Each structure stands twice: as structure tokens, then as C-alpha cells.
Design a protein around this nucleic acid. Structure first.
Ligand SMILES: [Mg+2]
Ligand SMILES: [Mg+2]
Ligand SMILES: [Mg+2]
Ligand SMILES: [Mg+2]
Ligand SMILES: [Mg+2]
Ligand SMILES: [Mg+2]
Ligand SMILES: [Mg+2]
Ligand SMILES: [Mg+2]
Ligand SMILES: [Mg+2]
Ligand SMILES: [Mg+2]
Ligand SMILES: [Mg+2]
Ligand SMILES: [Mg+2]
Ligand SMILES: [Mg+2]
Ligand SMILES: [Mg+2]
Ligand SMILES: [Mg+2]
Ligand SMILES: [Mg+2]
Ligand SMILES: [Mg+2]
Ligand SMILES: [Mg+2]
Ligand SMILES: [Mg+2]
Ligand SMILES: [Mg+2]
Ligand SMILES: [Mg+2]
Ligand SMILES: [Mg+2]
Ligand SMILES: [Mg+2]
Ligand SMILES: [Mg+2]
Ligand SMILES: [Mg+2]
Ligand SMILES: [Mg+2]
Ligand SMILES: [Mg+2]
Ligand SMILES: [Mg+2]
Ligand SMILES: [Mg+2]
Ligand SMILES: [Mg+2]
Ligand SMILES: [Mg+2]
Lengths: 187, 104, 176, 49, 159
RNA sequence: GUCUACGGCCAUACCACCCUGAACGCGCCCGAUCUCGUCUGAUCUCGGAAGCUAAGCAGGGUCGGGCCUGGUUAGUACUUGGAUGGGAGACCGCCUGGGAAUACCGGGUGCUGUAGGCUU
RNA sequence: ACAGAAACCUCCCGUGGAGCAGAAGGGCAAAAGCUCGCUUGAUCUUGAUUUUCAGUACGAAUACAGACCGUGAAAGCGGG
RNA sequence: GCCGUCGCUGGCAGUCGGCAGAGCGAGAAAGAGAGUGGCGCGGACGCUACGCCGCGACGAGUAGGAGGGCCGCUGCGGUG
RNA sequence: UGGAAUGCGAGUGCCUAGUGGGCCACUUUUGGUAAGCAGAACUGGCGCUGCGGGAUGAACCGAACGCCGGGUUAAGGCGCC
RNA sequence: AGUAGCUGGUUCCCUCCAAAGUUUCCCUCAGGAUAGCUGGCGCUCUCCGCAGUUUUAUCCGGUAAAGCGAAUGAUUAGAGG
RNA sequence: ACGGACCAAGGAGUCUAACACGUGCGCGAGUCGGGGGCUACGAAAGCCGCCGUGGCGCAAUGAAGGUGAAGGCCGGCGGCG
């Protein structure tokens, strides 16, 4: 007998996409090869994000892509997101962008192209940037989901700003006892 | 009927399955709970930091010039050692050629 | 200590570790009887600790070596002074043996103390071992062999090859 | 570099001692096997290697 | 069961040492405590204000807040399988500067001095500590004196 | 050599008794108009300067008590970890490490910071 | 003097052997006790923390911060 | 020796053939680099990439959880 | 000169079942004359666990388990069974 | 098809991980909620950090032992005044 | 300790609703026609767009009346100084 624990032997991590999409799996075949046969860590990161689930691939808005592609030294670099590029109506002017994405919404496509930009697919990124050179890999906000408002210390604990689960919002819905000192206590 | 009352038996075994972890440490600790009067001034100190911005630029550039100026003005066995030299892929590259030339 | 096999006699020399107070602490020597030298050093630290403010941590062994029997071909009488714990006390004994080696005599003492008093080796402290002249021996078991014309037969010699053959036709003869 | 060269070596998988033991449950100086037996480890290593 | 009393079991913990009662020496109040200081907490029964709870007696923490009379200390406390960083407000009678780091700060300066000095002499000097090594070979002089023979003493009933 | 004011550590400084205290100090001391407080100018407060080290205070002494610190007690008592050790038990021994406290014996008897004096 | 075992007056010793509401433990001597003088910090207010703890509530308690105040010559101390 | 699990988030698109040239496992970064001046007609298998291959460690299990079943039953759309 | 040794990849987040009768042993330990009694601390067990030994046996001693061959052992044994 | 914190039953295989009988609250004591213990899904990094360990410094403690010609409490014998 | 003499066949976590999280797909600051209407399998499928009413989301906060989500620099003037 060997003195060892086995509860952590199996690592919980995706080796492939749960999706049965045949176009996504053709891109995984592509980047499985590039990640294996090139020393480029960029390929490994993209291969990993192709396995990732829907909530681990948040959409990247147009306004946020412009901000991150406007930092100094990022001129003529292709912005890359393994996800969806959504349009942002709060933007007034779109610059000339070169972007690679899994999906670009219909209105984001017109605005990027109308500014003189180029929209790639990941099979076109490989031919243009086999090792990922001259790229800017970008991610959407992962905690930008309604669930993360409900996580943390339970709402009924001191200095807990977690959001409760209420069927309705209003004066009659979880506001008397425990939420104001006038009714029992507050914390 | 009567039953057992209390025990901590088996409890340290449970606590250690996922380890008794020490509290997480971050380089910046929150200012919660510090003296309100002290904190009020620390916010006033931070608020007007930009007033002396130009003086810092002047002093920093002045210090850099002086710092650069001074710097610019300022600036086992013989057999086993020989063999270890020859076996070195770079250093012994010419020493190895001499043996090969000699051998032929 | 287990009195395993025939014991050896070890000369163990030790001292306190030198310190600024006493750069040259005095040297101490003991006679140790043990199965191996590793046990011999262990028992030394057990004895000196009972006589001095010393122990393995605050002292060192300076010399451990086996003392060889000096006349292994001469029969001698050995007196042994020992103390031991019984089930209900401690006692001092004086005992005698005839042997060619002093470590052989000490081994006989351990077997004998085990046979006649059910005393385990861990409860026995051999204080002193001397070679004694025939005229100074006290125990009649030893003195009866101080006879220049000693003679005696070997009555009733038991068959020790009792399974070679296991079955025979003739019955054994015990007289020779 | 004893630390590095020694961590490099996998723990040695030794066989059961051929010829037996004395008493694994007590110290070597008690006639057993546990503890520090000093140079006498080499005899043990011969029978297990 | 036991009571949940705040000072239960501190009969000896908070009492004053033998013949050390009475006035508190005033150097207890002149110590300077800054943010980041390591201090050992030791409740003192003479002053009943700003007393640390018994569980914090004998623990060491870091100062994070300084008021007119007390300091805020971040001190670890183990409760079942977790260790919480607890913030306690203790009057400065019940703390003292810890020496646990002074040996370290002494070594840093010695380290920083030696590192600098050795560098300008082009030499290498050990900086890391080491565990005490096995003693090395040496000679022990007899001085023509045989070691004193020791024997076990006979048993004597000194009852 | 030493003192005064204010101290830090808080008997190695305390307690008891005895001896000696140059100079400057600190005192005792002499008064009650004023300030101030008392049954009482004893204390407290105030105004002084004839006398004295008698006392406080300082230094020293005592086969001194205490206190401080060593030795012994003692590798003892106790103790971590070990055994298919002993013993009916009570308990004890051994292995691996740590390791006390009385009685008894010796030594010591304040150090020192800031400022200001005295002491050819 | 009456006056005694015990009344009141005086000197001396006194490390607390008393007292501090109460159970006990801790603490306390130019004080935390006793006696006087003045008073209402036992008032108004937001947060933080501790104890029990699930790191919830209550209760109790601890450092502060802002007002008004008391006291003292003052440093300060006091929100039972 | 064999089975499975886990790990190496290991290797294989290079089956690059007469429009040919067979290698990249080896102690120690980065090119089997490109150039400018001084007769036969031949060469196994592989690759359902959800595939195939290599190396190392590991394997108790109630309550309970999860995975995989080219395990089994009835019916429906397709297909054979 | 990443400032002791040794070993080891870590951090983090959601959702979550069963459980919430335990019992035993070394040592410590309360009540009790004591109990295979009742009640605690520590660690390890049995519960959930087979296997060699203690004839037999929840817990003792050894040792923990994929299906096999060879070798060697532990605790225990070697008159015959 | 009344309710049942209670009794009884609860149907194929292999593979991997693997408990609790404890905390607090409850007209709570054959039951729940709660934390702990489990599993699953991952994800963020890696090929500095951490540790049921020691080492070196540094604090904390009033049990074992001891003491009572040391305080409190209990207690035997004489001796000198 | 309780159930089980034997054989066959039947025999126990389902469906509706609500919620939470995880995963897959579509579109994306939007999204959804579910109700309605138009035009054998077919009670299907297709369509509507001045049928998007309406739900959820895009804004929170307060009991409420209500309010409801960055600044700095330069130049000029008025006031205080
Ligand atoms: Mg195994
Ligand atoms: Mg397992
Ligand atoms: Mg229970
Ligand atoms: Mg053999
Ligand atoms: Mg054992
Ligand atoms: Mg004079
Ligand atoms: Mg007068
Ligand atoms: Mg005098
Ligand atoms: Mg004396
Ligand atoms: Mg003096
Ligand atoms: Mg007073
Ligand atoms: Mg205030
Ligand atoms: Mg298994
Ligand atoms: Mg019991
Ligand atoms: Mg059970
Ligand atoms: Mg288990
Ligand atoms: Mg088992
Ligand atoms: Mg039996
Ligand atoms: Mg076998
Ligand atoms: Mg047998
Ligand atoms: Mg019915
Ligand atoms: Mg019930
Ligand atoms: Mg697991
Ligand atoms: Mg109730
Ligand atoms: Mg039942
Ligand atoms: Mg106690
Ligand atoms: Mg005792
Ligand atoms: Mg029944
Ligand atoms: Mg029946
Ligand atoms: Mg979803
Ligand atoms: Mg029809």
C-alpha cells in the first residue's frame, strides 16, 4: 500500500467543446494542430477557449474593443476574441479595425466594415497569423452576468451586498426584519 | 432515551481534509475600521496630490540627469579542466578539430 | 538491551562536549558487554547518565573498541558483581563462573540470571567482572573443578541422533 | 547539489529483506529493527537491494 | 456545560505576577506603535479597559490602526477548520513590541552589508543560514592520563 | 568623590540597628502681616534666615533578616514517542528524547538618563 | 477621669491580613477604598470592532469620530 | 505479464516520391537556410483525428455523487 | 548570493447528495464498590474492509485489496492434526 | 389515493471519487434548518507559492512535579521563654 | 432479531407548475408571437411587422412626496483678501 489520496487525481477541465457544432470542431481540428506543432502559446490559449462554454465566452461589445485597441502601441494589430462581437449603440465613431471573432452581430458587421475595417474568421486568422503574431487577444467581461450579483456572502450577513432571490421587488418583499434596525435588526 | 452529549472526536480529521488554510494575504489591505479623523485627512492628502505634479516632474528629471551623469563618468584537476573544456560543444569546437586533424 | 548471542566486551570512552567553561572536560571509561558496538554505545550513555550530568546530546563517544580476551586458551574463574530488579525489589549479587573468555562468563551470567531468577537483560547491571584465583572462589559449583586429578565418567549417554534412522531394528545403548 | 541530485532520484523501491528481520516493532538497540543502526544499515541494504 | 462568560478561566492568566502589582511602569505608555508593527498581546488584569479577550492572550499580530490609547491589531484566530484574521482593539497596556522579527532585521542589515562588502572585494560569502552540521573530526588529548573508570553503584535501600 | 530637580528599570534599591558626613545643596528650623487652611500656623499655605546635623537624607558596617544570583538537590522527580516488556493487580523496568523545585552551601547588596551645582 | 472585654482621646507598628452593593475569581494604597466640594458622559449621533457565533440576532463590552456638557489650576478624565 | 483509471492538458495532418530524396531523441536557445562579392518507373501499414500511438504512476469501499455502456425492453421519424 | 532544512504545482467559483443514533483501544480523565456501566480529551480504528496471525471473535497484532507467474517477507509460527 | 417527523419495500452492468453521527437554532430529543464532512462542473495560472514536519529566533501558559522551617487552608510532636 | 414454502406474470421518484444553477443552440441591447389573424400526412408546417399589445432585459433608490448615475486645464471678469 501507498499512502496517497486519490480525490484530486482526475483534473476537471475541458479537452474539447461540449458543442456538437461541426464548424466549431473543424476549427478545433485546425488549432489542435497549430497548438501542437508550433511553439506559440497564443495558439494554446485560443485552442482552450474554443472548448469553453457559453458563459466562459462572454460577448465583447464594440465600445470595449475600441477602448482596448486604442491603447498605445496597438496600431495595425488584429483584435481577436473567441466569442461574439456585439454592437454598442453608445459609440458614435468606429475607427478602422481588423478583428477576428467567432460571431459578429449583423449591426456590428455593418459598422466595422463601413469604417474600413476587416472581419476575419478563425480559419483566416491561421493563414494570416499562424503563430498569432501581431494580435491582440481580447475577452468579454466574465462577471458581467446577472448570476454573479447573487454570489458571495449570504444576503443576511454583515456587510453582505449580495443580491437576494425575490419573486417580486417592492416595499412588501423582504425589507422589514433584518434589513432595517426599526424591525428587529440590521446587519 | 439518553444519547451522547458532545464530542470533537473526528473533527480535526475533517478540518484537515481540505487543509486549515491561513487567511489570504494581499499587498493592499482595506482601510476599513481605521480612525475616521485620520482617514479624513488621508483623503485630503490624496485629493490634492496633483498640486505638486509639476514639481515632481522637475525634480525627477533633474535627478535622472545627475544619476546618468555620474554613471557615465564612472564607466579539480588541470586534466579534468582541459577535458571539460574540449567536451564543451562551443568552446571545444576548435580543440576538437585539432584532434581530428591530428588523427588523420 | 537484548543479550543476543555471545556478548562482546567493549571499551567505551566518552566525555562532555567541550565548552568555554571547561575546554578539556575529563574523560570517562566503562566496561560494556553487549551484542554489537551500536548497543555498546547506547548502554554507555545509559550508565554515565546515571553517574554524571551527561547524556548523548551533551557528550560524545571518543573511543569504542572491542577488548579481546587476553588468555583465550586458559581456564579462569570469574567473579561477577551485578545488581538486578526482581518483581518486587532490587538486589546485589555476587556470582562465579568458569570460562576461557571474560565475555563468555558474562554471557553465562545473563543466561543464568534468566534461568534462575527470570530476570530479563534490561533489568541487569553488571557492575564488576574480575578473574579470581581458585583459592578465593566461594561457590561450590566452581570449586569442585579445582582438582588436579579430576576424573569422571559420562553416565547414561542419551541418543541424540533420534531420527537417523527414524525406524531401526536394534534398541539404543546408553552405556559407553 | 545534494538536494537536486537526490530529489532527482526516485525513492528506491527495495524488496523484503531476504533472511528476515529481528523485530520491526522495537528499536535496533533492543534487538529490533527500528531506529539508527549506524553502519549496520549496510548489511540491511545488502539483503534488500 | 460551561458558561459563556467573557473572563471565565482567566484566574491566573490576567492576575499580576508575584510582587509585581500596583502601579504600571510608565515606559509601558511611552512605547511608540506604528502601522505594520508586530506586537505580542498579553492581557493585564490591572487595567480593565481595552482588555483583549482570553483567546488573544499569547498571540502575536500586526498593528493596523492607532488611536489615542489603543491600537487595532490584525491577529489570526483558529476556529474549527478555518483561521480568521481578527481585528481587535486593545489598549497599549496589553501589548508589547515583538522581538520575533528583530533577529530577522538584524540579519538583513548584516546580509546587506556583507553582500555589498563582498561584492567590492570580488569574493563570495555565505548569506543563508544553515542547520547545525554534524561535528567534524578532531583529536582528544589524553595528556598521559588514563580515563577514569566508571562502574554502576550497588543498590541501597535509603528508605 | 558627591549632591539637587525631574526621571527609567522598580528591594543588588527593602527592613533593623550602629558609625561617619568637607563644600554646595536638600533639610530640620524661626514667624503668621499678607495669600490660604485648620479645634490646634501640628499639617497645608505664606514671610523668613538666629541656630543644628540631633533627625530626615548620603556613604559605610552587621559570621544581620529579606532580596538578586550561582551550586547542590540531580540527570533525581516528572515527562514526548515504543514494545506480543514484567507483574493477578497496584504499579514498575527498559528503549528514544526533554528535563524540574525545597532543605543545605557560596557570592552580591542598585545601575543609569537629562539638566544644574559642589569638590586644586 | 468616670471607662470595665468592648465608648472616646494620644503615640507607635501595620503589604492590605480592610473596604470596594451582591456569588466567587481577578484588580486596587498620596487609590479603584474613606471623607468632602462641584455636578448629571446614566445626555444627543453615524459607522467600526469584540464576546456567543453559523463568524446570524439579541445582550453585554471595546476603540474611535461628531455635538453638547461636567470637573480640574491643568494635563486630562467622564458618554453609567 | 495482462486489464482499466489518471497524468504527461504527451506524439501523429510529413502518406511533403522520379515536379523523389526518406533525418529533427538529443546533455546544455536559435537554419539539415537562400543566394552576392573577394539500364529499371519501384518504394509495407497507417488517419472511423469522437481516430491511432507512446511513456509513467496508480486500483478497498457502505451512505452518496458522476461517467461510460456495440447492455436490455416497448413504440415513433429515417435508413438497411 | 529569491536570504534555514525537507517535501510538494497551485489558486479560485458555482451547484450539490448522504449524514446530523455511533461504538472500540493506548494514554489522560469525571461519577460510581464496580460493570461488557455512564460521561469527556488526544490520536488511531471498527462503522464502510477484505486479507496473514490471535483455534474461534466488528475493534487485538501484521498488513490494507485490479487479474496472474516467480522471489521475499511481517506479525506469528515449525511433535501430529 | 385523508395525514403520518413512524414500520416495510424500492427493479441492469462496469468505471472513477467517496462520507457523517459533530457545531449553532428550533414545543428541538425517532425530526428539521445550519456549518462541517462528499461529489460534480469547471475556470485562472504554473511547469512563485504552499505544508497536520523540523530548524533558528521570539513570545504565551500554571498542568505533572515540587513547597508548606514561603502567603491561604488543614495538621502531629516535643523544646525554650 | 423481523420478512421469505415454491413458480409465473404484475409491482414503486412520475407528470404539471414555479424557482435556481450548469450545459447546448439561436439572435443580441435586444429578444420572444406563446394569443390572434392570413394562406391523407395536416390538430402539421409557412407567413404577419402599422399584429411587439405585452413579458423579460436596457436604472437605481426612497415608506412616500420624489429624485435618478465622471472631470480638469486655459483665458476674462465680479467678490473676499
Ligand atoms: Mg495497490
Ligand atoms: Mg478511493
Ligand atoms: Mg446525537
Ligand atoms: Mg530463503
Ligand atoms: Mg502498535
Ligand atoms: Mg557642614
Ligand atoms: Mg511652625
Ligand atoms: Mg549623625
Ligand atoms: Mg544575609
Ligand atoms: Mg547608591
Ligand atoms: Mg484621590
Ligand atoms: Mg466625544
Ligand atoms: Mg474502486
Ligand atoms: Mg463508554
Ligand atoms: Mg450505519
Ligand atoms: Mg475510511
Ligand atoms: Mg481493516
Ligand atoms: Mg485464543
Ligand atoms: Mg506470491
Ligand atoms: Mg498452528
Ligand atoms: Mg389510505
Ligand atoms: Mg419523530
Ligand atoms: Mg473527486
Ligand atoms: Mg418555540
Ligand atoms: Mg428506527
Ligand atoms: Mg488550571
Ligand atoms: Mg500535585
Ligand atoms: Mg420490526
Ligand atoms: Mg414467516
Ligand atoms: Mg442557460
Ligand atoms: Mg389529423
Amino acid at each position: 500500500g501507498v499512502d496517497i489520496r486519490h480525490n484530486k487525481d482526475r483534473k476537471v477541465r475541458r479537452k474539447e467543446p461540449k458543442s456538437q457544432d461541426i464548424y466549431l470542431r473543424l476549427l478545433v481540428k485546425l488549432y489542435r494542430f497549430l497548438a501542437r506543432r508550433t511553439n506559440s502559446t497564443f495558439n494554446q490559449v485560443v485552442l482552450k477557449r474554443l472548448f469553453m462554454s457559453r458563459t466562459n465566452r462572454p460577448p465583447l461589445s464594440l465600445s470595449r474593443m475600441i477602448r482596448k485597441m486604442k491603447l498605445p502601441g496597438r496600431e495595425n494589430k488584429t483584435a481577436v476574441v473567441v466569442g461574439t462581437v456585439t454592437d454598442d449603440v453608445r459609440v458614435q465613431e468606429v475607427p478602422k479595425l481588423k478583428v477576428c471573432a467567432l460571431r459578429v452581430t449583423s449591426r456590428a458587421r455593418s459598422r466595422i466594415l463601413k469604417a474600413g475595417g476587416k472581419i476575419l474568421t478563425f480559419d483566416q486568422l491561421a493563414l494570416d497569423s499562424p503563430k498569432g503574431r501581431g494580435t491582440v487577444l481580447l475577452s468579454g467581461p466574465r462577471k458581467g452576468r446577472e448570476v454573479y450579483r447573487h454570489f458571495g456572502k449570504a444576503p443576511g450577513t454583515p456587510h453582505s451586498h449580495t443580491k437576494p432571490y425575490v419573486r417580486s421587488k417592492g416595499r412588501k418583499f423582504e425589507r422589514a426584519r433584518g434589513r432595517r434596525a426599526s424591525r428587529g435588526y440590521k446587519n | 432515551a439518553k444519547s451522547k452529549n458532545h464530542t470533537t472526536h473526528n473533527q480535526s480529521r475533517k478540518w484537515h481534509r481540505n487543509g486549515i488554510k491561513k487567511p489570504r494575504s494581499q499587498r493592499y489591505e482595506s482601510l476599513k475600521g481605521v480612525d475616521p479623523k485620520f482617514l479624513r485627512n488621508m483623503r485630503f492628502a490624496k485629493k490634492h496630490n496633483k498640486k505638486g505634479l509639476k514639481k515632481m516632474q522637475a525634480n525627477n528629471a533633474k535627478a535622472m540627469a545627475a544619476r546618468a551623469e555620474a554613471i557615465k563618468a564612472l564607466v579539480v584537476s588541470r586534466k579534468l579542466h582541459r577535458l571539460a573544456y574540449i567536451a564543451h560543444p562551443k568552446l571545444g569546437r576548435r580543440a576538437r578539430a585539432r584532434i581530428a586533424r591530428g588523427l588523420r | 538491551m537484548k543479550a543476543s548471542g555471545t556478548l562482546r566486551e567493549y571499551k567505551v570512552v566518552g566525555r562532555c562536549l567541550p565548552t568555554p567553561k571547561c575546554r578539556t572536560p575529563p574523560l570517562y571509561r566503562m566496561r560494556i558487554f553487549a551484542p554489537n558496538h551500536v548497543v555498546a554505545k547506547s548502554r554507555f550513555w545509559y550508565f554515565v547518565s546515571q553517574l554524571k550530568k551527561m547524556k548523548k546530546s551533551s557528550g560524545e563517544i571518543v573511543y569504542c573498541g572491542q577488548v579481546f580476551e587476553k588468555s583465550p586458551l586458559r581456564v579462569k574463574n570469574f567473579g561477577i558483581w551485578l545488581r538486578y530488579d526482581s518483581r518486587s525489589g532490587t538486589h546485589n549479587m555476587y556470582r562465579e563462573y568458569r570460562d576461557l573468555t571474560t565475555a563468555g562468563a558474562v554471557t553465562q551470567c545473563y543466561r543464568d540470571m534468566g534461568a534462575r531468577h527470570r530476570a530479563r537483560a534490561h533489568s541487569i547491571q553488571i557492575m564488576k567482572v574480575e578473574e579470581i584465583a581458585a583459592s578465593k572462589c566461594r561457590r561450590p559449583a566452581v570449586k569442585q573443578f579445582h582438582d588436579s586429578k579430576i576424573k569422571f565418567p559420562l553416565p547414561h549417554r542419551v541418543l541424540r541422533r533420534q531420527h537417523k534412522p527414524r525406524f531401526t531394528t536394534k534398541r539404543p545403548n546408553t552405556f559407553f | 547539489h545534494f538536494k537536486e541530485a537526490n530529489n532527482f532520484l526516485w525513492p528506491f523501491k527495495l524488496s523484503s529483506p531476504r533472511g528476515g528481520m529481528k523485530k520491526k516493532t522495537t528499536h535496533f538497540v533492543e534487538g529490533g529493527d527500528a531506529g539508527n543502526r549506524e553502519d549496520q544499515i549496510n548489511r540491511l541494504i545488502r539483503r534488500m537491494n | 456545560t460551561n458558561t459563556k462568560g467573557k473572563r471565565r478561566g482567566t484566574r491566573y492568566m490576567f492576575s499580576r505576577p508575584f510582587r509585581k502589582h500596583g502601579v504600571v511602569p510608565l515606559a509601558t505608555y511611552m512605547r511608540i506603535y506604528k502601522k505594520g508593527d508586530i506586537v505580542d498581546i498579553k492581557g493585564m488584569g490591572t487595567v480593565q479597559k481595552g482588555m483583549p479577550h482570553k483567546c488573544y492572550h499569547g498571540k502575536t499580530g500586526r498593528v493596523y490602526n492607532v488611536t489615542q490609547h489603543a491600537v487595532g491589531i490584525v491577529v489570526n484566530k483558529q476556529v474549527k477548520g478555518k483561521i480568521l484574521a481578527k481585528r481587535i482593539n486593545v489598549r497599549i497596556e496589553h501589548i508589547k513590541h515583538s522581538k520575533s522579527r528583530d533577529s530577522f532585521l538584524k540579519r538583513v542589515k548584516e546580509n546587506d552589508q556583507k553582500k555589498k562588502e563582498a561584492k567590492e572585494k570580488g569574493t563570495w560569502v555565505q548569506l543563508k543560514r544553515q542547520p547545525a552540521p554534524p561535528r567534524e573530526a578532531h583529536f582528544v588529548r589524553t595528556n598521559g592520563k588514563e580515563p577514569e573508570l566508571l562502574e554502576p553503584i550497588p543498590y541501597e535501600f535509603m528508605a
